[PDB]
Amino acid sequence: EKENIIGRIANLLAVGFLYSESPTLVDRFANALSKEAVTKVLYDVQRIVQMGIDRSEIATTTITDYPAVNVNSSGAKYTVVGYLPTSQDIEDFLRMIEEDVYYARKAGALAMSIANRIKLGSKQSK
Amino acid sequence: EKENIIGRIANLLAVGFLYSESPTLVDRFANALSKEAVTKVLYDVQRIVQMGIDRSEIATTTITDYPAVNVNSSGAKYTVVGYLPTSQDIEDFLRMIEEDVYYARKAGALAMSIANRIKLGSKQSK
Amino acid sequence: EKENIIGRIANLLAVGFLYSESPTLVDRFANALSKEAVTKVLYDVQRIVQMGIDRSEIATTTITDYPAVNVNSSGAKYTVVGYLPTSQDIEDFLRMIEEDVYYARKAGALAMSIANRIKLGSKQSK
Amino acid sequence: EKENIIGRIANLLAVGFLYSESPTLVDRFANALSKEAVTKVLYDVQRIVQMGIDRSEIATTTITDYPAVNVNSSGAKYTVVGYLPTSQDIEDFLRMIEEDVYYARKAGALAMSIANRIKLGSKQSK
Amino acid sequence: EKENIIGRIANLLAVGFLYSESPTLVDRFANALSKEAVTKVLYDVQRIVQMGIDRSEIATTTITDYPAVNVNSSGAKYTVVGYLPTSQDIEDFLRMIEEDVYYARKAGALAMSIANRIKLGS
Amino acid sequence: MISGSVRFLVNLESLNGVESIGNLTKHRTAPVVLKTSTGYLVRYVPVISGEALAHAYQASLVDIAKKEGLPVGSLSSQYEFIKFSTDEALKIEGIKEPKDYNDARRFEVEVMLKDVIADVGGFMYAGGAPVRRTSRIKLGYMIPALRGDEIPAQLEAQFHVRFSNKPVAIFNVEVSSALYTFSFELDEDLIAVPSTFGEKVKGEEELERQKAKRVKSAIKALYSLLSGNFGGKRSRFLPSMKLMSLVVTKTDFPFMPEPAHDDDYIKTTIMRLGKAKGVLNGNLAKAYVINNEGIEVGEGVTVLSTVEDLVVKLEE
Amino acid sequence: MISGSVRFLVNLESLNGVESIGNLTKHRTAPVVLKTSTGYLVRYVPVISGEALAHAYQASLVDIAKKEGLPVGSLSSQYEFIKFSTDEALKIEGIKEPKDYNDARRFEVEVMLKDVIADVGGFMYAGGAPVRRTSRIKLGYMIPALRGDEIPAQLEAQFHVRFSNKPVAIFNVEVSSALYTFSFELDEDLIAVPSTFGEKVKGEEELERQKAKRVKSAIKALYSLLSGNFGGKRSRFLPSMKLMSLVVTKTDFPFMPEPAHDDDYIKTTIMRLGKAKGVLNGNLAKAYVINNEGIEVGEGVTVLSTVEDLVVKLEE
Amino acid sequence: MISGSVRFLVNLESLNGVESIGNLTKHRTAPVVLKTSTGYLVRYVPVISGEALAHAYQASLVDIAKKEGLPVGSLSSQYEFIKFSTDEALKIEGIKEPKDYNDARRFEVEVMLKDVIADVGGFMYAGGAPVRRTSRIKLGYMIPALRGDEIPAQLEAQFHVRFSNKPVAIFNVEVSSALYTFSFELDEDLIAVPSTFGEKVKGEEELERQKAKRVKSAIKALYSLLSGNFGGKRSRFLPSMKLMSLVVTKTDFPFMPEPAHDDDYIKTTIMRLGKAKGVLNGNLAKAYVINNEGIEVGEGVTVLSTVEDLVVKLEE
DSSP for G285-305, written as a single string: EEEEEEESS-----SS-EE-S
Beta-carbon contacts of F225 under 8 Å, excluding residues fewer than 6 positions away, are F53, F56, F57, F60, F139, F184
Distance of alpha carbon H98 from alpha carbon H106, whole angstroms: 8
Q: Are the C-beta atoms of H51 and G160 separated by less than 8 Å?
A: yes
Question: How many angstroms separate the Cα of C19 from the Cα of each of C74, G306, H238?
Answer: 8, 72, 62
Question: Residue G2 forms beta bridges with which residues?
Answer: G186, G250
Cβ distance F9 to F152 under 8 Å?
Answer: no
Q: Which of residues 157-216 of G touch H (CB under 8 A)?
A: 158-160, 162-165, 175, 177-179
For chain B, count helices (H), then strands (E): 5, 3
Pair F236, F173: CB distance under 8 Å: no
Residues 6+ apart with CB under 8 A from D21: D73, D74
How many CB atoms are closer than 10 A to CB F296?
A: 10
For residue F157, the cross-strand partners are F174
Record: contact H19-D51, CB cut-off 8 A: no
Rounded-to-integer distance, Cα H302 and Cα H284, Å: 15
**Amino acid letter at D103?**
Y
Q: Is F265 in contact with F259 (CB distance < 8 Å)?
A: yes
Please state, in angstroms and rounded to a whole number, the distance separating the CA atoms of residues C4 and C62.
Answer: 18
Within 8 A of H258 by CB-CB distance, chain G residues are 242
- H or E stretch covering B106: helix B102-125
- Give the residue from E46, E49, E41, E113 showing the smallest Cα distance to E81: E113
- Look at D43 and A108 and tell me if their CB atoms are within 8 Å: yes
Resolution (A): 3.5
Compare CB distances from H154 to A24, A27, A34 and report the shortest one's residue. Answer: A34
- Put simply, whether G79 touches D (Cβ < 8 Å) is no
d(CA H130, CA G206): 41
Q: Which amino acid is at G111?
A: V
What sign does the CA torsion over D108, D111, D117, D120 have? negative
Cβ within 8 Å of residue H64, ≥6 positions away: H217, H220, H221
Could you tell me how many residues make up chain C? 126
Rounded to an integer, what distance in angstroms lies between the CA atom of residue C16 and that of residue C27? Answer: 12
Say if the Cβ atoms of E50 and D114 lie within 8 Å.
no
In this structure, are strands H302-303 and H285-291 parallel, antiparallel, or unpaired? Answer: parallel
Q: Which residues contact A15 (CB under 8 A, 6 or more apart)?
A: A49, A52, A58, A69, A71, A80, A84
Fill in the amino acid letter for H303.
V
- Chain F residues whose CB is inside 8 A of the H197 CB are 165
Nearest to B30 by CA among B6, B53, B2, B63: B6
Beta H123-125 vs H143-144: how paired, if at all?
A: unpaired
- Specify whether the CB–CB gap between F185 and F250 falls below 8 A: no
Angle at G101 between CA G100 and CA G102, to 5 degrees: 95
Residues in chain G with CB shorter than 8 Å from the CB of D27 are 24
Q: How far apart are the first and last CA of chain B?
A: 38
CA nearest neighbour of D45 among D64, D19, D74: D19
Q: Measured between alpha carbons, how far is H240 from H15 in angstroms, rounded to an integer?
A: 12
- Contact state of B90 with C105 under an 8 Å Cβ cutoff: no
- Give Cα H281 distance to the centre of its chain: 29
Cα atoms in the Cβ-side hemisphere of radius 13 Å centred on H38: 6
Cα G172 from Cα G179, distance rounded (Å): 24
For residues E115 and E107, what is the distance between their CA atoms, to the nearest angstrom?
A: 12
Residues in chain G: 316
Compare CB distances from A116 to D36, D40, D50 and report the shortest one's residue. Answer: D50
Shortest distance between the Cα of A30 and any Cα of chain H, in A, equals 12
For chains A and H, CB pairs below 8 A equal 15
C-beta neighbour count of H126 within 10 angstroms = 11
The answer, yes or no, to whether C and E have at least 3 beta-carbon pairs within 8 Å is no
Residue F190 burial (CB count, 10 A): 14
Q: How many CA atoms lie within 13 A of A2 on its CB side?
A: 10
Q: Is E47 on the interface with D (CB under 8 A)?
A: yes
Question: How far apart are alpha carbons H277 and H284 in whole angstroms?
Answer: 8
How far is C10 from C111, CA to CA, in rounded Å? 4
Contacts of C68 (CB under 8 A, 6+ apart): C60, C61, C62, C79, C80, C81, C82
Q: Which residues of D touch G150 (CB under 8 A)?
A: none
What gap in Å lies between CA G60 and CA B105, rounded to an integer?
Answer: 57
Angle between helices E102-121 and E87-99 (to 10 degrees): 130
Q: What is the DSSP string of H31-91?
A: EEEEEETTEEEEEEEE-B-HHHHHHHHHHHHHHHHHHHT----HHHHTT---TT-SHHHHH
As for chain F, the residues directly before each break of C–N over 2.5 Å are 168
What SS3 class is residue G240?
strand
The sign one gets for the Cα dihedral H53, H56, H59, H64 is negative
* Contact (Cβ atoms closer than 8 angstroms) between residue G27 and residue G174: yes
Distance CA B63, CA F248 (A): 68
Helix (H, G, I), strand (E, B) or coil at B56: coil
CA-angle at G199, arms to G197 and G200, nearest 5° = 115
In chain A, beta strands by DSSP E: 58-63, 66-73, 76-81
Q: How many CB atoms lie within 10 A of CB H161?
A: 8
Report the residue count for chain E.
122
Residue type, E30: A
Helix axes B2-20, B102-125, angle to 10 degrees: 50
Q: Which ranges constitute the DSSP H helices of chain D?
A: 2-20, 24-30, 35-54, 87-99, 102-125
| Residues β-bridged to residue F285 | F251
Please report residues of H whose CB lies closer than 8 A to that of A34.
154
Cα–Cα distance for residue pair H9/H180, rounded to 1 Å: 6
One-character DSSP codes across A15-37: HHHHHH---HHHHHHHT--SHHH
State the pairing for strand pair E58-63/E66-73. antiparallel
Bridge-based pairing of strands F285-291 and F302-303 is parallel
Residues of A in contact with H38 (CB under 8 A): none
Q: Which residue type does H97 have?
A: E
Interaxial angle between packed helices G267-280 and F308-315, expressed in degrees from 0 to 180 and rounded to the nearest 10: 30
CB count in 10 Å sphere of residue F249: 22
Dihedrals φ, ψ of F48, to 5°? -130, 130
DSSP reduced 3-state for G22: coil
* Radius of gyration of the CA atoms of chain D, in A: 14
Q: How far apart are the first and last CA of chain A?
A: 38
Measured CA distances, H64 to G258, H69, H82, H115 (Å): 55, 9, 19, 13
Contact status of D99 with chain A (Cβ, < 8 Å): no
CB of E94 within 8 Å of any CB in chain D? yes
* G168 touches E: beta carbon within 8 Å: no
The Cα–Cα gap between H297 and H287 comes to 11
Technique that determined the structure: cryo-EM
Q: How far is D100 from chain G (nearest CA, A)?
A: 9
Chain G residues within an 8 Å CB radius of F165: 78, 80
Q: Is H50's CB within 8 Å of G237's CB?
A: yes
Please answer yes or no on whether H276 and G235 come within 8 Å at the CB atom. Answer: no
Distance of alpha carbon F313 from alpha carbon F310, whole angstroms: 5
State whether the Cα torsion G118-G124-G126-G132 is positive or negative: positive
Neighbouring C-alpha atoms within 13 Å toward the C-beta of C98:
6
Give the pairing of strands G170-178 and G285-291. Answer: unpaired
Instruction: Name the minimum distance, in Å, from the CA of C99 to any CA of chain B.
Output: 15
- Side-chain-side CA neighbours of residue A113 (13 Å): 22
CA dihedral (E87, E89, E95, E97) in degrees, to 10, reads -110
HSE value, Cβ hemisphere, 13 Å, CA-based, for E101? 17
CB atoms within 10 A of CB C53: 14
How many angstroms away from the CA of D78 is the closest CA of chain G? 26
User: Identity (one letter) of the amino acid at A114?
Assistant: I
Whole-number Å distance between alpha carbons of H131 and H97: 10
Collapsed DSSP state (helix, strand, coil) of residue G44? strand
Nearest to B53 by CA among B61, B42, B62: B61
G89-96 contacts at long range (C-beta below 8 A, 24 or more positions apart): none
Q: How many residues comprise chain D?
A: 126
Distance from CA of D64 to the nearest CA of H (A): 33
Subunit contact F165:H130, Cβ cutoff 8 A: no
Chain D partners within 8 Å of E56 (Cβ)? 123
Residue C83 Cα distances to C11, C20, C56, C69, angstroms: 7, 19, 17, 7
Report CB contact under 8 Å: D24, H22: no
Burial of residue H202 (CB within 10 Å: 0-12, 13-18, 19+) is exposed
Task: Tell me whether residues D36 and A102 touch, CB distance under 8 A.
Answer: yes
Handedness of CA D105, D107, D110, D115 (dihedral sign): negative
Question: Are H43 and A28 within 8 A, CB to CB?
Answer: no
SS3 label, residue F181: strand
String of DSSP letters for H244-303: EEEEEEEESS---PPPTTSS--SHHHHHHHHHHHHHHT-S-EEEEEEESS-----SS-EE
C-alpha to C-alpha distance for H148 and G35, rounded to whole angstroms: 30
Distance, CA of A76 to CA of A19 (rounded, Å):
9
How far is the C-alpha of H276 from the C-alpha of G311, rounded, in Å?
10
Q: How many CB pairs under 8 A join F and H?
A: 4
How many Å apart are CA A23 and CA A28, to the nearest integer?
9
Among D residues 49-108, those touching chain G with beta carbons less than 8 Å apart: 101
Interface E-G: count of C-beta contacts within 8 A:
5
Question: Is B85 touching C (CB cutoff 8 A)?
Answer: yes
Q: What is the Cα–Cα distance from B83 to B61, expressed in whole angstroms?
A: 10
Q: How many whole angstroms separate alpha carbon H15 and alpha carbon H234?
A: 7
CA quadruple F196, F201, F207, F209: dihedral sign: positive
Contact E24 G21 (CB under 8 A): no
Q: How far apart are CA F19 and CA F27, in angstroms?
A: 9
Rg of chain H in Å (alpha carbons): 22
Q: Does residue A30 sit at the D interface (CB-CB below 8 Å)?
A: yes
Q: Searching chain F, which residue's CA lies closest to the CA of residue G5?
A: F240
A 10 A CB-CB count for H165 gives: 4
Query: What DSSP line would sit under A109-122, residue for residue?
Result: HHHHHHHHHHHHHH
Residues of C in contact with B49 (CB under 8 A): 116
Name the amino acid, one letter, at G36. Answer: T
Task: Select from B99, B93, B48, B98 the least CA-distant residue to B69.
Answer: B48
Residue of B4, B2, B40 lying closest to B24 (CA atoms): B40
Taking the C-alpha atoms of residue C125 and residue D17, their distance in angstroms, rounded to an integer, is 72
Bridge-partner residues for C4, per DSSP? Answer: none
What three-state secondary structure class fits D8?
helix
CB G243 within 8 A of CB G274: no
Report whether G81 contacts G52 (CB < 8 A): no
Distance CA E48, CA D54 (A): 33
Rounded to the nearest 10°, the torsion over CA H122, H126, H130, H136 is: 10
Helices within chain F (DSSP H only): 50-68, 74-77, 87-93, 104-114, 116-120, 204-220, 222-227, 266-280, 308-315
- In one letter, which amino acid is F251? T
Cβ-defined contact of E53 to D119 (cutoff 8 Å): yes
Determine the distance in angstroms separating the CA of G158 from the nearest CA of chain H, rounded to an integer. 9
Counting one residue from G and one from H, how many pairs have CB atoms under 8 Å apart? 105
Give the closest-approach CA distance of B113 to chain A in angstroms: 5
Type of residue at H226: L
> Looking at chain E, which subunits does it touch, using at least 3 CB pairs closer than 8 Å as the criterion?
D, F, G
Query: Inter-chain contact G229–H140, Cβ cutoff 8 Å?
Result: no
Q: Is E24 on the interface with G (CB under 8 A)?
A: yes
Q: Which one of E57, E87, E93 makes the best mutation probe of the D interface by having the most chain D beta carbons within 10 Å?
A: E87
CB F201 within 8 A of CB F106: yes
Q: How far apart are CA F212 and CA G226, in angstroms?
A: 46
Contacts of C77 (CB under 8 A, 6+ apart): C70, C71, C122
> CA torsion sign, D58 to D59 to D62 to D68?
positive
Q: Which residues contact A49 (CB under 8 A, 6 or more apart)?
A: A12, A15, A16, A19, A58, A84, B116
